[model samples]
Target: PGSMVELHTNHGVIKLELDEAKAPKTVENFLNYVKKGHYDGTIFHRVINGFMIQGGGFEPGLKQKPTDAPIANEANNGLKNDTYTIAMARTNDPHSATAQFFINVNDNEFLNHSSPTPQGWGYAVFGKVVEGQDIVDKIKAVKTGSHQDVPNDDVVIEKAVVV
Candidate 1:
């Protein structure tokens, strides 16, 4: 399958065509995470309906997953957070992103660019929903829970890999 990477979830599978040129650092960082199986057993702890589905920061039991050193900001790398775009998951601090990521089910322009935007504050749009937009949408429509940091259960990563 020519190094094809497939992300299979409860809703569907997403085929990623790696852009090794545009995002070498980001992709290498993510591939290292996948190869290390860092995302296995992680949960989509933060799921926002009609916007984005965030995970890889915790497990299903609401346990926070430990992260490695943060990566640089890729927001200005020319990728847009349009529908189905995948990006690095980071906190208020731009360089705080590690092994977490999300699939944008909707156009989240607010998180795109900000005024006085502190360095590395924007979400890094990495890849897009090339083959699973419907699956992403289905995940978005799923029922969520209010157990912990998450208020909704739009969807879960179930597991991730380089395939």
Candidate 2:
């Protein structure tokens, strides 16, 4: 209900501390997903060396779960994708982000706050890893596979709930 939240993944737990004052909509949307169990069983479908780790949607089975609703692009809210920061993944449409989220494993300044199109802006950063970053590091180091669309080893979010 405050700044920090925990995601208990299969590998280990990850703690995210949201920047509510900066990204209210993004933060609220993620908290709502957590409360609704929207992130349970989701798998990290994308990972890149020296880039980021994406998850919070889909499962090891690669099924895209139905999301509650879409939230406004908080990219205009001025949050940036720093290392260990958490943000949502979406299509070319800026407002299309639902449940899919990612954690910046490195300082990806390019993926941070920026506007690429007249309609689509940047990815909104809602939170940062305040704890269990090493667990994330371990996930990052795991051998990946071509499971689903992810060519890297799959990192699963075993369950996510308001804590």
Candidate 3:
């Protein structure tokens, strides 16, 4: 429950506190990505003002990066998509979340789990922005367009590591 990670972004540094107890596999996978330096140079490809800012799987030109297998959906872990909380970004396949993750700028109860069914399964919330909420706010305010609402200015993660 005390695990923490630091993300060095072009805009600023954001600190994340991972809830390992509730999300064991999620923390393991995320910290593994951090330890292996997979987050380096990754750009936040999707940023929505009232929604969440998504990243950790693309480069400056919107080029997708390769990732390991998808992890199981842990939305039932009791974590909610509260503001500043970090959650896995997956496809329609409830359990298809990979390296991509998103940070909630608002409390999104709609993203919470209602049932175990695929249609009701939701994104897994694993961590929270313990510090640099301001930086997150700053990132969310950037100009975005294109299919993914990619920030006009690339919000690069210079480095990510455990702390």
Candidate 4:
């Protein structure tokens, strides 16, 4: 069992139910960011309709925010990157995830873990959207442009608090 966090965005609030049993370290890491108000005022910088909406890493002007040290890969912890699930965003290196996360707008099975290899090392899922998925739908429908998925109108996280 773990805690829940509410992300208050301009469109609406999206609540996440953290699953510590399946991804202990990943849940703990995300909660640490919530406790420190790290996601406040950050923008969902990347929004791909059929993919996911990524955030918790950039500010208003697309400037990347500094994050804490990276954490281990928990992608193989039996969690899948299904729609509305929240996962850590990492580089090709499996263990390189930090504060960046994405909300899967659709079931992205390809992002699920299959092996220990570079290509098979998928993103770590730590939570799920227990409420306000309509808000996520609204976000997915925003006008996006050439900034490689940045919304034409900012989808700002006004505040994020553990509830």
- How does each model score on TM-score? 0.84, 0.88, 0.97, 0.97
User: C-alpha displacement of 53 in model 2, angstroms?
Assistant: 0.7
| Ranked candidates (TM-score, high to low) | 4, 3, 2, 1
Q: Could you give candidate 3's per-residue lDDT for residues 97-159 as a string of tens digits?
A: 879999999999999987899888988999999999999999999988865588877999999
- lDDT tens digits by residue: candidate 2, 16-39: 888889888888888888888888
lDDT for 62 in candidate 1 is: 76
Better candidate number, 1 or 3, judged by lDDT? 3
Among all windows of 10 consecutive residues in model 2, the one with the lowest summed lDDT is: 145-154
Tens digit per residue, CA lDDT, model 4, 24-136: 99999999998899999899999999899999999998888789999999999988999999999998889999998999998899999999889998999999999999999
Q: Best by TM-score, which number?
A: 4
For model 2 the local lDDT of residue 31 reads 85
Give the Å shift of residue 61 in candidate 2.
1.7
User: Per-residue alpha-carbon lDDT of model 1 for 106-147, expressed as tens digits?
Assistant: 778877744336743578776666677677676666666656
For residue 105, what is the lDDT in candidate 1?
77
Query: Candidate 4: global Cα-lDDT?
Result: 0.93
**What TM-score would you give candidate 4 relative to the actual structure?**
0.97
- lDDT sort, best first: 4, 3, 2, 1
- Cα miss at 56, model 3 (Å)? 0.2
Best by lDDT: 4
